[PDB]
Amino acid sequence: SEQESVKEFLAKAKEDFLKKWENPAQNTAHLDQFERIKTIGTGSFGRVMLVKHMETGNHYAMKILDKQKVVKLKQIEHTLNEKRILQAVNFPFLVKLEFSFKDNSNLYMVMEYMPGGDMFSHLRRIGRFSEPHARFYAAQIVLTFEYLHSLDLIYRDLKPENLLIDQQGYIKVADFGFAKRVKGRTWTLCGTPEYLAPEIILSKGYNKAVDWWALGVLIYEMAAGYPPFFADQPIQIYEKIVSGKVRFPSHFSSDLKDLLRNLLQVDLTKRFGNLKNGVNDIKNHKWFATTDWIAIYQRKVEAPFIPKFKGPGDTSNFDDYEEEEIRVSINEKCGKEFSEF
């Protein structure tokens, strides 16, 4: 009934999700309702811009995908997954999708804006997080994966770049570009090199255990300041991952190392998160013996770090990108491919 209060929450969470999953929100705004301010992210998989919604004056982060470019990258089904999943989920540590729409040329997903920036930014600059600091963030990802995995979702891109820091110092997971709802096994080669579980690299069928492996990587990176497996090129990273060996900094506590040995376990029959006890093997480990799990969910734990507020609209925590116009063709592109978006 400790773990059974958890089940009452998770069964209600599931009812809520299934309603939206089976009946997704569609066409809830239009481009010319937003003022474009700044590009705060780019990449092969679209771009992200700070925008202001005119009728409210709220700031949001607007993801823009070129439909023709999605097709070329063979990410149609993955993009349909991203939007359908994000419009259906509701958890304190997931970024909220406020609007979605499309025009002749692009797809748009408008999320709440987090002026605080990504964890990546802050972690690289500070160098490393203390164990208590690492633990606070890791507890939020533990709860988030509990949530997601109970909905049959695998997330598949855990890394500091995808975690935003809010105004209270708590985390928000963004970018669901590889998230998928799957019972049983799946096979797609996706993720980021440093975070991939051995089973992905070896093209085996895999499951939600790959998210628990990635948690191992993240905790390590947070607490060490560098990842457990690094080299100059991906192929050298994969050799290290599939070797079975991992070295821990001397400042790592004996409880942290033991947690990590169990998350970064090549043998799926022994990896924490994947066994008969599930998430509780993680939640009840000695490293999290001080962690009040409900207090974390309710955001009543004091955060180790709160980013400096410079206003709504401030972009000081993001880098500078080349501004590219939003072309909207007069002919509809890829209508059938993205009909459900």
């Binding site: 160098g127 570009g177 993720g191 980021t192 560098y226 080299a231 100059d232 090129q233």
Partner: peptide, 20 residues
Amino acid sequence: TTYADFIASGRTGRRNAIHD
């Protein structure tokens, strides 16, 4: 040191996702 090796590497910036 391991830290010095990381900081001198080509993979200290934001990392891109892979795909097939």
